[PDB]
Design a protein around this ligand. Structure first.
Ligand SMILES: *[C@](O)(C(=O)NC1CC1)[C@H](CCC)NC(=O)[C@@H]1[C@H]2CCC[C@H]2CN1C(=O)[C@@H](NC(=O)[C@@H](NC(=O)c1cnccn1)C1CCCCC1)C(C)(C)C
Ligand SMILES: [Zn+2]
Length: 193
C-alpha cells in the first residue's frame, strides 16, 4: 500500500488563486512509505499524490475530501503518522479524512447558482455552467490534459462556496466538453447517515 502525500496546496483566500508545490518526486516517494509528514499545511485545496497519480483534495466542513478512484482506501500522511479515512463511499466515488491541521474548510453552497467555477491543479479558475445534479458545461472547451490532475478539486459558487467535487470529464478526441462532479449534497449525506 502507501499513504497519500500532500505535495502542495491551492489558496483561494485572496484576489487570485495560486498553487505552491511544497514537495518533490523523491521526497513524496519517501513520505508515502513512512506516513509521517511534518510540513505546514495551508489552503482550502491540497495537491495530493499516490505512487502513480497527482490530483486535488478539498476541505469542506472540516473534512478533506477527494476521489475514491484516486485515493482508494489509503491513509493520508500527517505529522502524527498515517491517518485512517473517516469516510469511504465507493458508490459516490468519495473518500474523506479529518481535515489536516493548518487547513481551511469551504462552506457548502446554499444559493443554487448555475454559475460554477472549477479550480484546477494549476490554480486556473474555469467557469462551468451547471446542467443537472452532477454535470456542467465548459463555456470554453479545453484539452483534457488541462484538467488532468484536477480530480478532487472544487466547483464553486460565485460566492466562493463548495458546490461539488470534480471527478471526471466528458471528452471527445482529447477535448473536454463538460465536467462531472460529486455534489456537496452527497458529502453531506455521507456524514449524515
Ligand atoms: C482525475 O482522477 C485526475 O485528475 N487524475 C489524476 C491525473 C491522474 C481525472 C481527471 C480527468 C479529466 N479523472 C478521471 O480520470 C476520470 C475517472 C473517474 C471516472 C472514470 C475515470 C475516467 N475519467 C475521465 O474523466 C474520463 N472520462 C470518461 O470516461 C467519461 N466518458 C466519456 O467522456 C465518453 C465516453 N464514451 C464516449 C465519449 N465520451 C465518463 C462519462 C460518464 C461519467 C464518468 C466519465 C476521461 C476520458 C479520462 C476524460
Ligand atoms: Zn452558493
Amino acid at each position: 500500500k502507501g499513504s497519500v502525500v500532500i505535495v502542495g496546496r491551492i489558496n483561494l483566500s485572496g484576489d487570485t488563486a495560486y498553487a505552491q508545490q511544497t514537495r518533490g518526486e523523491e521526497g513524496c516517494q519517501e513520505t508515502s512509505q513512512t506516513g509521517r509528514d511534518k510540513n505546514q499545511v495551508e489552503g482550502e485545496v491540497q495537491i495530493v499524490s499516490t505512487a502513480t497519480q497527482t490530483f486535488l483534495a478539498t476541505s469542506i466542513n472540516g473534512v478533506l475530501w477527494t476521489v475514491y478512484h484516486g485515493a482508494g482506501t489509503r491513509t493520508i500522511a500527517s505529522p502524527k503518522g498515517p491517518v485512517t479515512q473517516m469516510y469511504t463511499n465507493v458508490d459516490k466515488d468519495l473518500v474523506g479524512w479529518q481535515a489536516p491541521q493548518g487547513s481551511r474548510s469551504l462552506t457548502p453552497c446554499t444559493c443554487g447558482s448555475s454559475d460554477l467555477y472549477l479550480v484546477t491543479r494549476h490554480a486556473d479558475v474555469i467557469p462551468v455552467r451547471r446542467r443537472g445534479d452532477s454535470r456542467g458545461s465548459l463555456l470554453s472547451p479545453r484539452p483534457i490534459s488541462y484538467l488532468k490532475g484536477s480530480s478532487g478539486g472544487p466547483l464553486l459558487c460565485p460566492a466562493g462556496h463548495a458546490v461539488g467535487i470534480f471527478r471526471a470529464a466528458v471528452s471527445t478526441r482529447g477535448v473536454a466538453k463538460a465536467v462531472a462532479f460529486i455534489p456537496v449534497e452527497s458529502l453531506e449525506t455521507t456524514m449524515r447517515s
